[PDB]
Amino acid sequence: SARRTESDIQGFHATPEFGGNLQKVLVDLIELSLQGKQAHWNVVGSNFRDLHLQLDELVDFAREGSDTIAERMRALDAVPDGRSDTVAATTTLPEFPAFERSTADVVDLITTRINATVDTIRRVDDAVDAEDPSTADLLDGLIDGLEKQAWLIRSENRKV
Amino acid sequence: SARRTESDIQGFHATPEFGGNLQKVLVDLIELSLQGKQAHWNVVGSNFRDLHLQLDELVDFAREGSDTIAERMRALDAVPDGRSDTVAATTTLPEFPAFERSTADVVDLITTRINATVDTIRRVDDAVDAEDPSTADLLDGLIDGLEKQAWLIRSENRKV
Amino acid sequence: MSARRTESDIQGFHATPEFGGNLQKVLVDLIELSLQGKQAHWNVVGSNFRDLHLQLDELVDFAREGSDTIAERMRALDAVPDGRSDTVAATTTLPEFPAFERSTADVVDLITTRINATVDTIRRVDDAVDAEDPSTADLLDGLIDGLEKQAWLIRSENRKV
Amino acid sequence: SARRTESDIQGFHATPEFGGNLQKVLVDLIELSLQGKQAHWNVVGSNFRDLHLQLDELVDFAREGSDTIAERMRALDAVPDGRSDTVAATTTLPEFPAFERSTADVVDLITTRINATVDTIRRVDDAVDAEDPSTADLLDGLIDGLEKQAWLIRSENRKV
Amino acid sequence: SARRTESDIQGFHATPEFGGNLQKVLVDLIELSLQGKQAHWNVVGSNFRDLHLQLDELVDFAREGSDTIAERMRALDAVPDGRSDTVAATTTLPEFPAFERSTADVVDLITTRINATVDTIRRVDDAVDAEDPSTADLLDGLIDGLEKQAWLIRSENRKV
Amino acid sequence: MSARRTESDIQGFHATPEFGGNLQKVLVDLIELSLQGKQAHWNVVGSNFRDLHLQLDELVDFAREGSDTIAERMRALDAVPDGRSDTVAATTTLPEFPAFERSTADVVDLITTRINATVDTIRRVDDAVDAEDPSTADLLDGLIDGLEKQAWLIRSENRKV
Amino acid sequence: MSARRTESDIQGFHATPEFGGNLQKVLVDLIELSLQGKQAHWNVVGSNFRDLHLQLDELVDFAREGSDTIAERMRALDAVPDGRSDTVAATTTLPEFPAFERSTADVVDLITTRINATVDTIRRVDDAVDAEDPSTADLLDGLIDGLEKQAWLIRSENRKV
Amino acid sequence: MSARRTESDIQGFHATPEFGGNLQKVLVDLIELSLQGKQAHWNVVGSNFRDLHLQLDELVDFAREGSDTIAERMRALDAVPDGRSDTVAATTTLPEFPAFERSTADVVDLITTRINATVDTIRRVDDAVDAEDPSTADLLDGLIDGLEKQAWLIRSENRKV
Amino acid sequence: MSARRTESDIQGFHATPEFGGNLQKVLVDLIELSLQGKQAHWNVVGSNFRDLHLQLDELVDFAREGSDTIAERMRALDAVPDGRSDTVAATTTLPEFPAFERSTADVVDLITTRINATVDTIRRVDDAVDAEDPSTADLLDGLIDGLEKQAWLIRSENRKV
Amino acid sequence: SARRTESDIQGFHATPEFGGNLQKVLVDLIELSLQGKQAHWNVVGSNFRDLHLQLDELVDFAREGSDTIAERMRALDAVPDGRSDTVAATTTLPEFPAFERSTADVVDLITTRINATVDTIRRVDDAVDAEDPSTADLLDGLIDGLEKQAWLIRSENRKV
Amino acid sequence: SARRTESDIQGFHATPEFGGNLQKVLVDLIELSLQGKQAHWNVVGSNFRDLHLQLDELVDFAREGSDTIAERMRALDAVPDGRSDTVAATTTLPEFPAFERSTADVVDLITTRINATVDTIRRVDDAVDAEDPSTADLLDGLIDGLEKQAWLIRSENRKV
Amino acid sequence: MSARRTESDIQGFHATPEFGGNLQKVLVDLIELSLQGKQAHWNVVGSNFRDLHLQLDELVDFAREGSDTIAERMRALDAVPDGRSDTVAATTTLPEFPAFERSTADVVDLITTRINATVDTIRRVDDAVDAEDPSTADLLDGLIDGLEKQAWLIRSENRKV
Ligand SMILES: [Cl-]
Ligand SMILES: [Cl-]
Ligand SMILES: [Cl-]
Ligand SMILES: [Cl-]
Ligand SMILES: [Fe+2]
Ligand SMILES: [Fe+2]
Ligand SMILES: [Fe+2]
Ligand SMILES: [Fe+2]
Ligand SMILES: [Fe+2]
Ligand SMILES: [Fe+2]
Ligand SMILES: [Fe+2]
Ligand SMILES: [Fe+2]
Ligand SMILES: [Fe+2]
Ligand SMILES: [Fe+2]
Ligand SMILES: [Fe+2]
Ligand SMILES: [Fe+2]
Ligand SMILES: [Mg+2]
Ligand SMILES: [Mg+2]
Ligand SMILES: [Mg+2]
Ligand SMILES: [Mg+2]
C-alpha cells in the first residue's frame, strides 16, 4: 500500500569530514581517560580520597563517552582509531606530568584536561550538527557530563 | 604532537541573561515540587490513590529537574537561588490552595501549574539554545517529561 | 513581591495536524519493524543463528520502547496515535518481510534494509518536527541513534574484509 | 549398556494441522497486544491511570505469550507468521475502534477482545492436547493469565 | 477478514459444583496457612531453627496458593469465602493444638495436616480437570509444592 | 574479669499473664484484619476496582507482618500466641465482613471501620503494655502508625469535599 | 461472632488542633531545611567540597522523607498539612541561608546551626505530642536521631582538637 | 458446625514401583545429558564457537534443574532416586558423547541427538506417569517444553535455507 | 523572615556525663557479645551445628549494628565512646566465654545467658536514658527487642516439652 | 619501540603430564558433585534440613570447581573428559551407597568423599605448581573451599 | 575401577606451631577491627567524612579476614581464640588512644596499626606456606587488602 | 600481660626499584591490550561478528581491572605507575594493532597473539616478583589465569576439527 518496493534500501552514510570530526573527539576522550587514571593512582595529600574517587567517576564517564563516539562512527560506517600511538600523536590535551602530584595540583591539571576535551567537542559541534543532528545530541550529552565533572573537581580549589 | 600548550584552559562561561533564564526555570520547578507534594497529601475523593501516586511521580521528576538545572548553572559558573523566600517571590505559578481538595479539582489545578512550568521553559528555550545547545537539550527533556505528566494527570477529567 | 500568574486555566502545547501526521508515520514504521523483527527472530536459521536470534530481540525491544514513546508524545501534545494492525499494514513504508524460514545471511540483509527504511522515515520528518517542537525532535534523534546502532550490530555479519 | 546405538535420533515433529492450530493462537495474541497498546494510549476519563497501567500489564502478558507460542512452533519445526498483513487478515478479534475512548468503553471493548483470544485457545486446546500435552499445558497457562486480566479489567464496570 | 462480529463476547463461567470444589481447596489452604504460622511460633526443642524456618516456607506457599485459587474463582465468576468463621466451620484439617510443641510432634502434626490439604485437592482434581483443564494445572502445582513441603518436613522424623 | 558477672544461669525478661493476654488481643484482631482484607481484595467490584484491589493487598501485607511481629514478641517474652482460626473467630472484636461481591464504595467503608477497630484494640492496650515493657509498646506504636496510614489511604476514596 | 463489635461506623483517632499545629511547626522547618540543604549542596565551594556536597544530599534525603512522614501522619489523624513555599517562608524558625557561593567551612557552621534549629523545634514539641499520641512522638524521635546524626557528620569537619 | 477430620496419622501419596522406575529412567538421562552438555561446552571448537559454548551452559542449567526436580518428586512420593555415576553410565539410553575436541557443526548434531533421546525417554513414560499422577506429568511436560526449546536453539546453527 | 530565629550559633542537644556513662555500659556489653558470638560461631560442634553456626552470625550482625548505633548516638550527643579491647575486657558485665570447642547444647545455654546479661544492662539503664532523651531510649528499645528475639531463637533448641 | 616484531606469538602450552594431573582433579570434583546430589536427595533423620541444604552448597562449590579446572585445561590447550563412563572408571572416591541414609551416616560418608577429593588435589599440587603457579593457585582455592565444606559437614557428628 | 577402599579418609591436620601462627594473625586482625571502629567514631577535623568512611571499609575487610582465618583454623582442626581478654593480652598492635583525635593524627595512628598487622602476617607467611600453601594464599590476600587500605588512608598526610 | 609493640611509627613494605619496573612492564602491556581490545571491538566485521564484538568487551573489562589492580599495588608498595599514552606506546611489547576494519578471522588471530604477548610479559616477571613479594605474584597469577581464559574463548573460533 505505502510499502516501498525496493530490496536494497541504503542507510545514512557519514562523510569522511564528519568521521574525521568524531575522530578528533574520540582521541581526546581516550586521552582524558588515560590521564584520569594516572591522576587517580598518583594523587596524594589533603582530601586524597574524594579526588581519588571523583577521578574514577570522570574516567567512567569518558570511557563510556569514547565507546559511544566510536560506535556512532561505526553506525554511520566511519572507522575509529583509538590505538595508543594515534591517541598520543593526535590528542590536543596537554601532557599529564609524571610522578606523585598533590591534590591541589591534580585538581588544576585535570580541570584543564577536561576543559580541553570539552573545547574539542564544542569546536566540532556545529559542523557535526549540520550533517547529523542525532550525533550532535550525543556530543551535547558529553559536553554536559564533562562540564559537570570539571565543576565537581575544580570546586575543591575554589576560594570565596 | 598536536598537544596544546596552555597550562590553564578555561571552561565555558554563561552570560548573566543565560544564568537569569535558568534561574527562572529553577524557581518554577521547585515551586511545582512543593505544590505537587501539597496536592499529594491533601487530595481526597474519587480515584484518590491513582492521583496520590501519580503526583509523587511528578514531584520526583521536578526535583531531579531542579537539581539538573541548578547544577548546570554551577557548571557554567552561574549561581542558583532555590531558597523559599526567593521561590515564593519569583515563581510564575498560580498559588496552590490550602486544605483538602477533590481529585477533580486537584487534576485541574496541577495540570494548570505543570503547564505554567512548561511555558516558562519553552519561553527561555530559544535564547538558551542560541548560547548553549547542550543546556537546551536538558530543557527539552524537562518539557518532554512534564508534558507527559500533564497528560497522565489531566486524562482523569477528560470528557469523551 | 509576587510574580505569580493569575489564570486558573493555563493551556498546554497543542500539535498541528501536520505534526501529528508526521509522528503517526514514525509510529507505524516502528511497530512494523517490531513485528518484522520478531518474525526474523523466530524464523532465522543457519550459520551464526544464535547471535542474530538474540540481537533481533534487542532490536524489537528498542523499537517497542520507541513506538510507546512516540505514541505517548502524541498524546501529550493532544494528537491521537493509531497503532492498529490494519493501519500499520496499510500505511507502513517498510517492504514486507518474506514468509517462512530465511537464512542468517538473508535475514541480516532484509532486517538491515527495514531498519534503514524506518530511520529514513524519521530523518524525513525530523526537520519539520524540530521546527514546531525541538523536544520531540530530540526523541526522534534518540531513535535514529539507537536504530542505526542496531543496523550496524546486525549488518556487520555480512560485511567482508 | 542401555545406550541407544544410533547417531541420528529424530525429535518430535508437529503435524501441519498442529502448526496451524498454534498459528491461530499466535495471530490473536499479537492482535490483542496491538489492540492493548492502542487502548493504553487512547483511554481517557474516570480512573484513567489504573486502566492505562493494567493495559500495559495485559500487553506484557500477551507479548510473552506470543513469543512462547511462536517459539513452541519452532521447537516442533512448525513456522509461525506474525507479520502485520497476516495478523490483520486472519485474527478473529473484533477491530478496536479509532480515537480516544472513555475508560468505561475501553473496559468493555478490551474484555471482549481478551475473551475472543481465550476462546481461540479453548477452541484448539483438545486437538493440541491430543497430539502434544506439553503444548496444551502452555495454552492452559495462557488461558489462566488472560482470564485473570479479563477479571482485573472488567471489574471496573461491574455493578453490585 | 476473519474478524468476529460480536460486540460483547462473554468469558468462561464455572458451574456451582466447580465453584464449590475450589472453595473446598481454598478453606484448607487458608487453614494450613494459619496452622503453619501457629507451628512456626510455638515449636520448641531439638532442631528448632530448621523447622521454624521451613514452616515459614510452607506458609508462604500456602498463602500464594490460596490467593491463586480465590482469584481463579473470581476469573471464572465464582465467589470465594475465606473468612475466619467459614474456614473454622468448613476446613477438613484436624485441629492444630495450642501451646508449645516439641519439634518431633510438630513434624508429625504438620505432615498430617499437609497431607489432609493435598487429599482435598486430589479429591476434586478429576472433576475440576473435566470442566476446566487450566484450573486443574493450578491444582497440580499445589499438589507438587505441598507434597514437596511434606517431604522436607517429615524427613526429620524418619527412622533409617 | 573485673566487672564480669559470675552467674551460670541468667534468665530473660518474662511477660506477665496480663501482658500476654493484652498481646493476644492485638494478635487475633491483626489476623482477622488480614483475613478480611484478603476477602475484600478478591470480592471488591466496581468504580476504581484496581486501586482498592492493590491497596487491600498492601494492608494485608502490613497486618501479616504485624501479627508475626506480635506473636514472636510474645514468644521472646515466654508468652504463647494462639492464631488458630477457631480462636480468631471466637475472640476477634472486628465486625464480621459480609459475604459475596461488594462495591468499591462499600468495601472502603467496611475496611476503614475494621482497620479502626483493630487500631482501637492496640490503643486500648498500649498504656498497660508500655507500663510493663516500653520496647513492646514501641512495636505497638509502629502498628498504630502503619494501620492508621492504611485507613487514610483507603477511606480517602469515599471522601466528598 | 462471640466478641465481635456490631458497630457499622467506627471512627479513627482524631488529632486535636494543638497537635495539628505542633506537627505543622515540625513540617515547615523540615521543608525549609530541605530547601536550604539543596542551596548549600549546589553553592558550596572550597576545601573538601565533595564530602560536603555529598553529605548535604544525604541530609536533604532524610529531611524530605521526614516532611512526607509528618505530613502524612497529619493526614492519617485528620489534620491538614501546609507545605507551600509562602507558608514555609513566612513561618519557618530557621535562620535564612545566605545567597551566593559559600566556603565549605562557612557551610558547615551554617548548616549545623540550621539542623540544630530544626531539631529544637521537634524537641520543644515532643512532650505535648507524646502526651496525646505516643506513636507520633516515636516518629518525631526518629527524626531527632537522624538529624542529630547529620549534624555530627557535618560539624565534625570544622572541629579543632 | 465442624467438618474437621479426626485421624492423627494421615498418609501421603505413595508411588508404585513402576512409577518410581519410570522417573528413574528420566533422571539418569537428564544427568547424562548434563554431563555430555558440559563435555561439549568445554570441547567444542570452530566456526561460531562462542554461541554454542554459551548455549550449552544454558542447556546444562536446565537439565540440572530438571534432574533435581525429578529426583525430589521421587522423594516426595516415597521413591528413591539413583543418580550415581556408575548407575547413570550403566542405564542411560543416550548414545555416548565422543571424546576430545569436536567441531561446532558436529557438536550441534551430536547434542541435538542427545536432547532428542532425553525427550524421547520422557515422552515414552508420560502416559503411564500421567495415569497415576497428573501433577508429575506436568513436571515432565515442563521438561519436554524446555528441552525441545534448547534443541531448536542449538540445532538451527546447522539448518540450511 | 517573619518567624526566623536570628541566632548565628545554635548549639545541639548535649548529653550529660551520666547519660554518656550509661551508653558506654551498653556499648561494651554489645561489643563483648559480638566477640563472644563469633567465638561460639567458630568453635561450636555437635548435634544441629549448622543451625547454631548460622544463628550465631545473625546475633553478631545485630550486636555489631547495635554497637555502631549506640557509639554514633554518643558522638551525636557530644559523648565519646570507648570500644577498645582492654576497656571492653575490663568493664563488660558478661560472664567470660570459655575456650576450646563446645557442644551445641552448651553453646545454646552459654550464649542465651550472655544475651540476657546484655539485655539486663540495657533494661537497667533505660529509665534514666528515657528521662533525659526519649529518642535514645527508642534505640535502646530496638536493641532489647532484637536481642530478646535472638535469645528465643537460640534457647528454643534446648527446650524440653 | 619496545614492540615485538612477530605476528604469531605462542601462548603457554600445558604438557600432557600436566593435563593428566588436572584430569585427575576433574573426575573427582565431578564424582563429588554427583555423590553430593545423591546424599542431598536421600538423606533422612535428625537435622535433615541443615544437611540437605549444606549438601547443595557443597555441590555448588564442586560444580564451579570442575568447570574452573576443565576450562583451565582448555585455556592451556589440554582436553578434559567429564563423561559419566570416564568419571565412574577413573574416580578415586569410594562409591556412595544406594538408598536412604541417616543424617549421621551421610555426614561421615560425605566427609570422607570430600577428604578423598582434597587428597587428589594435594597429591598433584607440587607437580602442577612446578609447571604453572597460576593453576596451583586455583587448586589451592579448591583445597580451601572443600576443606571448609568438610568442617561444616563433619561438625554435626563431633562429640566434645 | 580406581575407587579407593577406605571407609574413613581423614583430612589435613595443622601442627601446633601452624595453629599458633594463625592465632597470632587472628588477634591482630580482631584488634585492628576494634581500633578501626574506635577511630571511625572518634575522628574529627579536616576531611572527617572521607576518613570516617574509609575506616569502615578497613573494618569490614579486617572482620572478613578474621572470620576467614578463624574458620581456616577450624577446617584444619585448630582452635581459634578471639575473646576480648585474649586479644588485649596478646595483640602486637600499639594501643589506640581514647577520646577525639584529629584526622591527621588518626591517619598516622591507623597507618601504623595496619602496618603492624601486616608485619605479623608477613612474619608467619613463610612457615605457613611451607606447611600449607592454600593457607598462605589466604594470608597473601590479607596482605594485599590491608596494604591497599594503608595506602588509601596514609595518602591524606603525604607531603608532595 | 601485654605483647603490644611500642613504636609510634611502623613502616610498610617498600618495593625495590627492580620490582617497580617489573610491575610497570605489566601495566603498560595491560593498558595497550585494553586499547587494542576496544579497537578490535569497534572494527571487527564478518562471519560471527557479534560473538567476537561481545567477547572483546569482556577482555577489555578484565584488562582494565587488571591494570588498575597492578597500578594500585604499585602505589601500596611505594612505587609510582606510568599509564600515560606516550609511555604506553613507547614501552609496550605488544605488536601494534593494525588500522581500519579487520575480518573476524584476522581479529581472532591478532588479539590472541596480543593476549599471548601480554601473558608472556607477566610470566617473565613472575619469578622475580614472587621472590620479593608472594602477595603480588598471586595478583599476577590471577591475571595470567583470566587472560589465558580470554585467549581460549577468542581463539577457538579459528580452531578446526
Ligand atoms: Cl497503581
Ligand atoms: Cl565518598
Ligand atoms: Cl551472547
Ligand atoms: Cl538454614
Ligand atoms: Fe560496547
Ligand atoms: Fe545532586
Ligand atoms: Fe507506557
Ligand atoms: Fe525470545
Ligand atoms: Fe493478589
Ligand atoms: Fe517469622
Ligand atoms: Fe508519600
Ligand atoms: Fe534441591
Ligand atoms: Fe558507622
Ligand atoms: Fe562455563
Ligand atoms: Fe562465617
Ligand atoms: Fe580504583
Ligand atoms: Mg574529603
Ligand atoms: Mg555467533
Ligand atoms: Mg484508580
Ligand atoms: Mg538444623
PDB file of C-alpha atoms in Angstrom, chain I residues 26-117:
ATOM      1  CA  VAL I  26      25.569  -0.670  76.816  1.00  0.00           C
ATOM      2  CA  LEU I  27      28.392  -0.279  74.267  1.00  0.00           C
ATOM      3  CA  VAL I  28      30.965  -2.555  75.982  1.00  0.00           C
ATOM      4  CA  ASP I  29      28.411  -5.332  76.542  1.00  0.00           C
ATOM      5  CA  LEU I  30      27.281  -5.162  72.896  1.00  0.00           C
ATOM      6  CA  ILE I  31      30.907  -5.418  71.719  1.00  0.00           C
ATOM      7  CA  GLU I  32      31.657  -8.241  74.195  1.00  0.00           C
ATOM      8  CA  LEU I  33      28.552 -10.081  72.977  1.00  0.00           C
ATOM      9  CA  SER I  34      29.797  -9.647  69.376  1.00  0.00           C
ATOM     10  CA  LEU I  35      33.214 -11.110  70.223  1.00  0.00           C
ATOM     11  CA  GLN I  36      31.708 -13.968  72.249  1.00  0.00           C
ATOM     12  CA  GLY I  37      29.157 -14.649  69.488  1.00  0.00           C
ATOM     13  CA  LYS I  38      31.942 -15.109  66.923  1.00  0.00           C
ATOM     14  CA  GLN I  39      33.950 -17.316  69.313  1.00  0.00           C
ATOM     15  CA  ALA I  40      30.852 -19.529  69.676  1.00  0.00           C
ATOM     16  CA  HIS I  41      30.236 -19.325  65.897  1.00  0.00           C
ATOM     17  CA  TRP I  42      33.694 -20.807  65.158  1.00  0.00           C
ATOM     18  CA  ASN I  43      34.042 -23.332  67.979  1.00  0.00           C
ATOM     19  CA  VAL I  44      30.542 -24.828  68.299  1.00  0.00           C
ATOM     20  CA  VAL I  45      30.393 -28.568  67.436  1.00  0.00           C
ATOM     21  CA  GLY I  46      27.840 -31.384  67.573  1.00  0.00           C
ATOM     22  CA  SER I  47      24.127 -32.024  67.065  1.00  0.00           C
ATOM     23  CA  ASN I  48      22.476 -29.291  64.944  1.00  0.00           C
ATOM     24  CA  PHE I  49      25.814 -27.475  64.397  1.00  0.00           C
ATOM     25  CA  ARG I  50      24.790 -25.675  61.195  1.00  0.00           C
ATOM     26  CA  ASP I  51      21.618 -24.013  62.552  1.00  0.00           C
ATOM     27  CA  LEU I  52      23.504 -22.683  65.573  1.00  0.00           C
ATOM     28  CA  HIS I  53      26.550 -21.733  63.499  1.00  0.00           C
ATOM     29  CA  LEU I  54      24.249 -19.670  61.236  1.00  0.00           C
ATOM     30  CA  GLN I  55      22.077 -18.172  64.007  1.00  0.00           C
ATOM     31  CA  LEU I  56      25.195 -17.047  65.897  1.00  0.00           C
ATOM     32  CA  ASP I  57      26.261 -14.944  62.900  1.00  0.00           C
ATOM     33  CA  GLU I  58      22.843 -13.280  62.802  1.00  0.00           C
ATOM     34  CA  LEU I  59      23.276 -12.448  66.507  1.00  0.00           C
ATOM     35  CA  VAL I  60      26.750 -10.997  65.848  1.00  0.00           C
ATOM     36  CA  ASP I  61      25.413  -8.975  62.895  1.00  0.00           C
ATOM     37  CA  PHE I  62      22.715  -7.434  65.107  1.00  0.00           C
ATOM     38  CA  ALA I  63      25.088  -6.799  68.035  1.00  0.00           C
ATOM     39  CA  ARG I  64      27.630  -5.117  65.702  1.00  0.00           C
ATOM     40  CA  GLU I  65      24.951  -2.851  64.193  1.00  0.00           C
ATOM     41  CA  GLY I  66      23.808  -2.064  67.751  1.00  0.00           C
ATOM     42  CA  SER I  67      27.274  -1.098  68.994  1.00  0.00           C
ATOM     43  CA  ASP I  68      27.792   1.211  66.000  1.00  0.00           C
ATOM     44  CA  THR I  69      24.328   2.749  66.566  1.00  0.00           C
ATOM     45  CA  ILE I  70      24.977   3.424  70.274  1.00  0.00           C
ATOM     46  CA  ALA I  71      28.539   4.668  69.694  1.00  0.00           C
ATOM     47  CA  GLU I  72      27.432   7.096  66.979  1.00  0.00           C
ATOM     48  CA  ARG I  73      24.478   8.201  69.120  1.00  0.00           C
ATOM     49  CA  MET I  74      27.070   9.085  71.784  1.00  0.00           C
ATOM     50  CA  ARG I  75      29.042  11.035  69.155  1.00  0.00           C
ATOM     51  CA  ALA I  76      25.908  12.898  68.015  1.00  0.00           C
ATOM     52  CA  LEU I  77      25.285  13.915  71.650  1.00  0.00           C
ATOM     53  CA  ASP I  78      28.912  15.037  72.185  1.00  0.00           C
ATOM     54  CA  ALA I  79      29.787  11.930  74.226  1.00  0.00           C
ATOM     55  CA  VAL I  80      32.883   9.847  73.455  1.00  0.00           C
ATOM     56  CA  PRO I  81      32.639   6.036  73.090  1.00  0.00           C
ATOM     57  CA  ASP I  82      35.406   3.637  74.101  1.00  0.00           C
ATOM     58  CA  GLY I  83      35.186   0.266  72.329  1.00  0.00           C
ATOM     59  CA  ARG I  84      38.842  -0.764  72.673  1.00  0.00           C
ATOM     60  CA  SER I  85      39.655  -4.369  73.638  1.00  0.00           C
ATOM     61  CA  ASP I  86      41.228  -3.518  77.033  1.00  0.00           C
ATOM     62  CA  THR I  87      38.236  -1.378  78.030  1.00  0.00           C
ATOM     63  CA  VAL I  88      35.695  -3.985  76.879  1.00  0.00           C
ATOM     64  CA  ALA I  89      37.538  -6.772  78.758  1.00  0.00           C
ATOM     65  CA  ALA I  90      37.955  -4.661  81.924  1.00  0.00           C
ATOM     66  CA  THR I  91      34.388  -3.285  82.062  1.00  0.00           C
ATOM     67  CA  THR I  92      31.987  -5.798  80.456  1.00  0.00           C
ATOM     68  CA  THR I  93      29.399  -7.408  82.750  1.00  0.00           C
ATOM     69  CA  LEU I  94      29.123 -10.533  80.573  1.00  0.00           C
ATOM     70  CA  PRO I  95      30.398 -13.803  82.063  1.00  0.00           C
ATOM     71  CA  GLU I  96      33.549 -14.947  80.252  1.00  0.00           C
ATOM     72  CA  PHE I  97      33.052 -17.293  77.305  1.00  0.00           C
ATOM     73  CA  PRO I  98      35.051 -20.494  77.780  1.00  0.00           C
ATOM     74  CA  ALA I  99      37.891 -21.552  75.486  1.00  0.00           C
ATOM     75  CA  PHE I 100      38.023 -24.590  73.165  1.00  0.00           C
ATOM     76  CA  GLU I 101      35.331 -26.464  71.225  1.00  0.00           C
ATOM     77  CA  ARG I 102      31.945 -26.542  72.968  1.00  0.00           C
ATOM     78  CA  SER I 103      28.894 -28.707  72.242  1.00  0.00           C
ATOM     79  CA  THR I 104      25.799 -27.162  70.638  1.00  0.00           C
ATOM     80  CA  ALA I 105      23.816 -27.769  73.860  1.00  0.00           C
ATOM     81  CA  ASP I 106      26.421 -25.922  75.973  1.00  0.00           C
ATOM     82  CA  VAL I 107      26.740 -23.085  73.441  1.00  0.00           C
ATOM     83  CA  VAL I 108      22.947 -22.588  73.488  1.00  0.00           C
ATOM     84  CA  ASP I 109      22.915 -22.198  77.305  1.00  0.00           C
ATOM     85  CA  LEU I 110      26.119 -20.103  77.354  1.00  0.00           C
ATOM     86  CA  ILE I 111      25.019 -17.665  74.628  1.00  0.00           C
ATOM     87  CA  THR I 112      21.432 -17.323  75.945  1.00  0.00           C
ATOM     88  CA  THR I 113      22.905 -16.333  79.338  1.00  0.00           C
ATOM     89  CA  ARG I 114      25.223 -13.768  77.751  1.00  0.00           C
ATOM     90  CA  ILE I 115      22.429 -12.284  75.618  1.00  0.00           C
ATOM     91  CA  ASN I 116      20.262 -11.948  78.743  1.00  0.00           C
ATOM     92  CA  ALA I 117      23.141 -10.214  80.580  1.00  0.00           C
TER      93      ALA I 117
END
